[PDB]
Design brief:
homodimer, Beta-clip-like, 5-stranded mixed sheet, 4-stranded mixed sheet, 22% strand, globular, binds ligand A1L57, binds sinefungin, binds zinc ion, Histone-lysine N-methyltransferase EHMT2 (chain B)
Amino acid sequence: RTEKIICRDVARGYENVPIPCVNGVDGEPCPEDYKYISENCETSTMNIDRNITHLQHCTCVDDCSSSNCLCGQLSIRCWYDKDGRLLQEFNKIEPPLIFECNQACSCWRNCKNRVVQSGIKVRLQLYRTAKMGWGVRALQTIPQGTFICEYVGELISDAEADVREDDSYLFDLDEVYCIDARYYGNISRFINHLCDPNIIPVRVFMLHQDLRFPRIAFFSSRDIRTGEELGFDYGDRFWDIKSKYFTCQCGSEKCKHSAEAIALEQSRLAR
Amino acid sequence: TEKIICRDVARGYENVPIPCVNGVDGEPCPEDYKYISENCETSTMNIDRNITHLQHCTCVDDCSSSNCLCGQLSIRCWYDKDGRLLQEFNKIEPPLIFECNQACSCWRNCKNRVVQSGIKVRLQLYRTAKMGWGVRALQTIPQGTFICEYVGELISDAEADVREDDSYLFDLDDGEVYCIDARYYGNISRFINHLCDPNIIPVRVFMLHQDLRFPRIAFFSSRDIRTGEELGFDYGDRFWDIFTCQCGSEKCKHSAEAIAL
Ligand SMILES: CCOc1ccc(NC(=O)[C@H](/C=C/C2CC2)NC(=O)c2ccc(Nc3ccncc3)cc2)cn1
Ligand SMILES: CCOc1ccc(NC(=O)[C@H](/C=C/C2CC2)NC(=O)c2ccc(Nc3ccncc3)cc2)cn1
Ligand SMILES: Nc1ncnc2c1ncn2[C@@H]1O[C@H](C[C@@H](N)CC[C@H](N)C(=O)O)[C@@H](O)[C@H]1O
Ligand SMILES: Nc1ncnc2c1ncn2[C@@H]1O[C@H](C[C@@H](N)CC[C@H](N)C(=O)O)[C@@H](O)[C@H]1O
Ligand SMILES: [Zn+2]
Ligand SMILES: [Zn+2]
Ligand SMILES: [Zn+2]
Ligand SMILES: [Zn+2]
Ligand SMILES: [Zn+2]
Ligand SMILES: [Zn+2]
Ligand SMILES: [Zn+2]
Ligand SMILES: [Zn+2]
């Protein structure tokens, strides 16, 4: 079998870079049961607070590289190095919310605290995996801490998420709001679960500071090689709903959710 | 002597820098406002942003055919292949323009996305002889070219009635009345002066939402504009009824001399 480019850009020109799709595995055509969007959408009344006078903002007249930047101080510090990468010291167990600079700040649009709002810069590819359906892989080396993409979809309420039948694309922001990428989503809806993940989600605020709606940004948690599949840990809660339907195919020696890992735990509980 | 007093009054928010110069007097770069590249809110406007309420096209091409719903909503698509308004465009009573949006099936680079792609022409903020600050072209600009949007603070009818200074107040004009006030928050368009012989015209456009209470205001050149020419639109007789005009045209109808006659 031969690899087959089946779409030049699944984003239809909406991202900074094209995101091609290939399938060198089976006969599945390019996925089209969803609407690609590059930014979050709403399908009910949400009234995101966008009052420009409500925004916390900085007075910096440099590039916001100093510890005096207010937006960095709201994040405890700015966690971006000079190349726009997330610092290794960033705490994954208890991450602070990231507050990027915004339209109320006195700084320029190219200051050092605007990584996520500047969008996708790495070359990604939608591709057919051997055992998980569609997936996303890197077409380049990606250093640790690099911004990858945002989890984009339909903003819905807690109550609406209870009503939704399919939560295979439902991200819990943790009233409680979620992002459902089932019907509307970006490239992130195709990122699979890995028990040994190489990206992590981070909560970020940019052009609004409405605390019901953090945006979810994925950053690499280690150096990523060309061709390597991207994935994050969906979390035990997702698997406590979903392992009755399918089991994990990540194949890692550390896999916590495989058919066998579940059976081994069940046999320890019996013994 | 002409001094450059700002490399970019937009602070990097537009596609191009917009420098400011002064070769007339001692006035420094204007700083009594906040530059913003898109409209802002200072109170709850409840703009309908429901993606399922958008009318949108099913175009599998570049939206240059007559089956594009978004062009049909605008009577036709009025943009030529270069993104300029057609010569047949009603420059006196323009129709509403519906550009393609996030619900359309077309690509982001189809032919119906001129205003949402932002400023392309090179402009300069500069100190005029008699009108304070103004905006001029640093290049020739063909007729029908998109210049910039009138950007500011969205305010209600009642809020506009309470405001003291309407020198930056654009009336969006059935239904609830709203205004764009660029006094406190605005982009480069807040500096465009009135001309009785204008060379740009405002056009109402819809892009990412279709809440008909809140058209966005796009300025297009109404004729070929020469390099160095000051940009201006006709503020309208209502503004002048509710300083005297220094436009200098032989057709100026708001001058001190005109008002006295
Ligand atoms: C820095 C942040 O760290 C995080 C945060 C979140 C994650 N992981 C997830 O969010 C996970 C994502 C699954 C992939 C398909 C997208 N999805 C879920 O847990 C999930 C949970 C509950 C649920 N149901 C209801 C929820 C609310 N109200 C009512 C019902 C649906 C899905 C990882 N790291
Ligand atoms: C759509 C294309 O057609 C148009 C439309 C409008 C224009 N021209 C103007 O909009 C004009 C703009 C003046 C320049 C300084 C910005 N401004 C005004 O008429 C104006 C009117 C009333 C007012 N006051 C209140 C209003 C409501 N409620 C309370 C008070 C303030 C300003 C030209 N062509
Ligand atoms: N580690 C995994 N093992 C098996 N299936 C997975 C795994 N991670 C994701 N999936 C599958 O992908 C769904 C989640 C999607 N967000 C990911 C894109 C999906 N692979 C697709 O082809 O559309 C899950 O409901 C599973 O069907
Ligand atoms: N044709 C004109 N003649 C005299 N003054 C004008 C004319 N057009 C605009 N102005 C002045 O500019 C104001 C409108 C502003 N939106 C334009 C920018 C203004 N020139 C400034 O320096 O900030 C008016 O209140 C007038 O002060
Ligand atoms: Zn700062
Ligand atoms: Zn900044
Ligand atoms: Zn800031
Ligand atoms: Zn696993
Ligand atoms: Zn179309
Ligand atoms: Zn289109
Ligand atoms: Zn369209
Ligand atoms: Zn005049």
